[PDB]
Design a protein around this ligand. Structure first.
Ligand SMILES: Nc1ncnc2c1ncn2[C@@H]1O[C@H](COP(=O)(O)OP(=O)(O)OP(O)(O)=S)[C@@H](O)[C@H]1O
Lengths: 459, 48, 47, 294
DNA sequence: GGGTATTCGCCGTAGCCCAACCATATGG
DNA sequence: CCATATGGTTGGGCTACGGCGAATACCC
């Protein structure tokens, strides 16, 4: 009759002692009642192994800030040549058009709310680079809630690659960020002596205080979160919003998003490009042997993905038993930042040869030398992730080879999904119409929206 | 009583194992509202 | 209309059987008595 | 259907057409004067892809050795099978040998190749295949004496030639159709009559059945190649009526699903051949194509 | 090698899984 | 005081005989 606590199974209620029976074995038991008549007979040798004792609110908020101007932006047309010098490359005229388009959306007193899309690998950073430079040109802070902390690290590397001649105080807050640096950055932008922040949603869950809520540029909201989309809405009180989410939500918001988000896609985003020479098969290890021979011939890098449902280092040893030539390394999650950044700088070193990830969030890096990608688990993947793997490898002046494997050759949803993947030819808007079909399946209302549009002007 | 021989762990429970159709008073069965019955089956006896 | 019902020409079952056989990569040659290849479809669905 | 009429004509078994129609072994078209491990090859011949490669590219064995150690064989040297090519590694086959990394080699290949040192120009280029007794280099002085593909060597001034055959064998219904294009039924009928003149009643009955089938091919006026399909017809859609029942479902003939799978696999393999894919998935996709049309 | 059975042998007869991220506790 | 083990958060996506015959067996 005690509120005992088993160290393994939590709650327990003391009932007495039992001299119960085993197969001819006389060991004794102390007995515990659990939740719903769980009568565990623990042997007495465990004597020290026991202890004693809704959304329409947010909808009308969204329609309010849609109806609300908020703030205006001056152009400042002299600062941007200075940092515009800092990238020695040409700008696509479609991209330059979308740049000036979203910047005139910034300069209006209405909230800037756009989405530039296009087939990836073209410097979607650069429009955000010069927009953020104009925003810090007026002293306003720049935030970047990122999909992956790896992409946060790479984006901070690119930002510091641009912010050499600027006194811009950049920072990255994540789980991977060390805690002294975490609360030091929380302090530094809480009083605003840190200018531009990147990171995952510790930025959104540790209740940080901001200093200028002007520009919010978020990418890849498709895997951010639905209630975390509402968390974005909590962050987005009277702000100007940019989404570089070329991969959208499956029309559960993107149906209504058309119309009030002026879709600002660009075509032929990069010139000098190559069609991704994809293939598809079931699994075969000799094909992997020939493929890694191909990539060591061209001297390139290899991504390799997995399901993470088990350990991946045993699979890695199996591939090394297949190929004892290259140097294969796993970038599995649930490791400290030391391990992850050591793997990142070793693949920057490149003595390690095959990046064995398990997630696009584990592998959303624009590594240049990669031109070979192989997937075992393409059956259990959403289409957006799949083409994000496809475009996530890809560099100038180089072909690319993709090897996606079907274990059953039979799952009809994934069969037609991989079919409408494999219809690809090259870059340019095929992802957009593919997303359109996926969003047709995504919905598969305007009436309440006509109601809320009416009352939002009254509010 | 899930009983491991070695560690003596006796996880005792009262599990639920589905439903068993009950005979009516007169001897029928009520399956999905339909009135059904079971007929005996003769066969060869076992043995030698 | 109140007259005698007339008599059909090419059989409906005949026609669908010819098209099923032509579906099986098998030409079937409907002949007269003097080996003139007679059409039963009147060039309706044939180029 | 037993007996297989294609196998009845082209003199095979059901297992062999199963092989060549599901890409298990090659079958030849012209022997081109090749050989198979001592016995020459003939028409309508099974051939593994191992043997296909061996008669096309051949058996080349490369060997490791102790690092920084000079071998008994020098660069571009004739090797006898059984030779101590290394300080300690015995030979395996017959051909000429090449080093990898001196200082004094690190590894050494040997190949099925003849060598002929050229002084003047070469009359051919690399990759050219040529029968014996035909000229190769030095204005015709260096000449081909083995069946093989030529590799020039301006470094050592040696026209070598890796000894291989140019036999054409294929794996497919295209190759079966190719063989079906090449059947004179007349001498076929005549030699069937000659087997009728033989006593042996079993071979007499087999030739009798083959003769009756080929006489049917004579009188019916048909190319046997028309047994192979190249453009499959598509039924009227109403005869496969995919219609909407009241429950929202579609009462659907399975022929629509069959046509869909065929169109999917066919256009997929068109796209696959459109890029020049590696051949393994090409073979697997043609396997699935024959499976689908089956 | 032709002739004679032969004997089997098949032909016909609406629920989870897993991934990343943030949090608390917890050990050097 | 700093650095992991494990918790729980949301999200993303996903499932047996008639019976002709025939290679074969048996025979001369
Ligand atoms: N003006 C430009 N024109 C063409 N390519 C550019 C330009 N600026 C940058 N790039 C390239 O675009 C790439 C940027 O990396 P990516 O992330 O792959 O492209 P992104 O579109 O910015 O990001 P995504 O679309 O989310 S993958 C780099 O390889 C740059 O070299």
């Amino acid at each position: 009759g005690d509120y005992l606590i088993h160290p393994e199974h939590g709650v327990g209620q003391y009932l007495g002692l039992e001299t119960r029976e085993v197969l001819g074995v006389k060991r004794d038991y102390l007995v515990l009642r659990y939740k719903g008549e769980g009568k565990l007979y623990l042997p007495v040798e465990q004597l020290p192994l026991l202890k004693r004792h809704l959304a329409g609110r947010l909808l009308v908020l969204q329609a309010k800030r849609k109806a609300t101007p908020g703030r205006a932006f001056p152009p400042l047309p002299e600062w941007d040549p200075l940092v515009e010098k800092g990238f020695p490359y040409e700008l696509t005229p479609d991209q330059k058009r979308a740049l000036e388009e979203v910047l005139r959306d910034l300069e209006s007193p209405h909230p800037m709310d756009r989405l530039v899309s296009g087939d990836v690998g073209f410097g979607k950073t650069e429009v955000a680079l010069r927009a953020a430079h104009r925003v810090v040109g007026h002293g306003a802070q720049v935030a970047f809630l990122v999909p992956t902390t790896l992409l946060a690290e790479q984006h901070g590397k690119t930002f510091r690659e641009r912010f050499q001649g600027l006194p811009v105080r950049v920072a990255v807050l994540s789980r991977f960020t060390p805690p002294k640096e975490e609360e030091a950055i929380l302090k530094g932008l809480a009083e605003g002596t840190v200018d531009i922040v990147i990171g995952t949603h510790r930025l959104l869950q540790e209740d940080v205080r901001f200093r200028d809520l002007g520009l919010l540029i978020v990418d890849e909201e498709h895997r951010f979160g639905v209630a975390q989309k509402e968390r974005i809405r909590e962050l987005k009180a009277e702000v100007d919003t940019l989404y570089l989410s070329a991969t959208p939500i499956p029309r559960t918001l993107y149906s209504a998003l058309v119309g009030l988000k002026d879709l600002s896609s660009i075509q032929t985003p990069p010139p000098g490009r190559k069609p991704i020479k994809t293939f598809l098969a079931p699994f075969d290890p000799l094909l992997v042997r020939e493929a890694i021979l191909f990539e060591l011939e061209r001297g390139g890098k290899v991504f390799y993905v997995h399901d993470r449902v088990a350990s991946i280092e045993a699979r890695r040893r199996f591939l090394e038993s297949l190929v004892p030539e290259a140097r294969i390394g796993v970038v599995h999650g649930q490791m400290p930042e030391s391990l992850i950044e050591e793997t990142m700088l070793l693949f920057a070193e490149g003595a390690y040869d095959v990046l064995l990830a398990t997630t696009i969030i584990e592998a959303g890096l624009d590594v240049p030398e990669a031109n070979t990608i192989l997937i075992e688990r393409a059956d259990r993947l959403g289409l957006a992730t799949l083409y994000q793997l496809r475009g996530r490898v890809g560099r100038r002046e180089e072909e690319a080879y993709a090897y996606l494997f079907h274990p059953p050759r039979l799952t009809e949803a994934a069969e037609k999904r991989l079919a409408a993947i494999a219809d690809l030819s090259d870059l340019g808007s095929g992802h957009l119409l593919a997303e359109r079909d996926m969003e047709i399946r995504g919905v598969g209302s305007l009436e309440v929206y006509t109601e809320l549009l009416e009352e939002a002007i009254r509010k | 009583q899930l009983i491991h021989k070695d560690t003596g762990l006796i996880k005792e429970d009262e599990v639920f194992l589905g439903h068993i159709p009950l005979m009516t008073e007169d001897g029928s069965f009520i399956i999905n509202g339909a009135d059904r019955v079971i007929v005996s089956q003769i066969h060869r006896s076992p043995g030698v | 209309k109140g007259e005698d019902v007339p008599e059909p020409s090419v059989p409906e079952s005949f026609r669908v059987l010819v098209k099923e056989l032509q579906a099986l990569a098998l030409d079937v040659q409907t002949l007269d008595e003097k080996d003139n290849p007679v059409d039963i479809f009147e060039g309706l669905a044939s180029k | 259907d037993v007996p297989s009429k294609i196998g009845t004509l082209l003199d095979l078994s059901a297992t062999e057409l199963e092989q060549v129609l599901y890409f298990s072994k090659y079958i030849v078209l012209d022997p081109k004067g090749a050989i198979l491990n001592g016995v020459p090859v003939e028409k309508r011949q099974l051939l593994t892809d191992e043997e296909y490669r061996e008669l096309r590219y051949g058996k080349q064995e490369t060997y490791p050795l102790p690092p920084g150690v000079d071998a008994l064989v020098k660069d571009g040297e004739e090797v006898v099978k059984g030779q101590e090519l290394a300080p300690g590694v015995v030979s395996r086959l017959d051909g000429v040998a090449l080093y990898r990394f001196p200082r004094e080699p690190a590894s050494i290949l040997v190949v099925k190749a003849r060598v002929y040192p050229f002084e003047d120009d070469v009359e051919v280029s690399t990759g050219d295949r040529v029968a014996p007794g035909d000229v190769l280099a030095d204005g015709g002085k260096v000449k081909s004496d083995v069946y093989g593909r030529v590799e020039v060597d301006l470094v050592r001034n040696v026209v070598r030639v890796v000894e291989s055959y140019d036999i054409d064998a294929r794996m497919g219904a295209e190759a079966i159709q190719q063989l079906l294009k090449e059947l004179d039924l007349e001498a076929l009928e005549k030699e069937l009559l000659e087997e009728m003149k033989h006593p042996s009643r079993a071979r007499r009955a087999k030739a009798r059945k083959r003769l009756e089938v080929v006489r049917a091919f004579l009188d019916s006026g048909n190319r046997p190649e028309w047994m192979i399909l190249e453009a499959v017809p598509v039924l009227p859609p109403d005869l496969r009526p995919m219609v909407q029942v009241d429950g929202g479902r579609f009462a659907t003939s399975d022929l629509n699903d069959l046509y869909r799978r065929l169109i999917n696999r066919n256009n997929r393999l068109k796209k696959l051949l459109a890029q020049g894919a590696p051949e393994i998935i090409i073979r697997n996709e043609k396997r699935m194509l024959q499976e689908a049309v089956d």
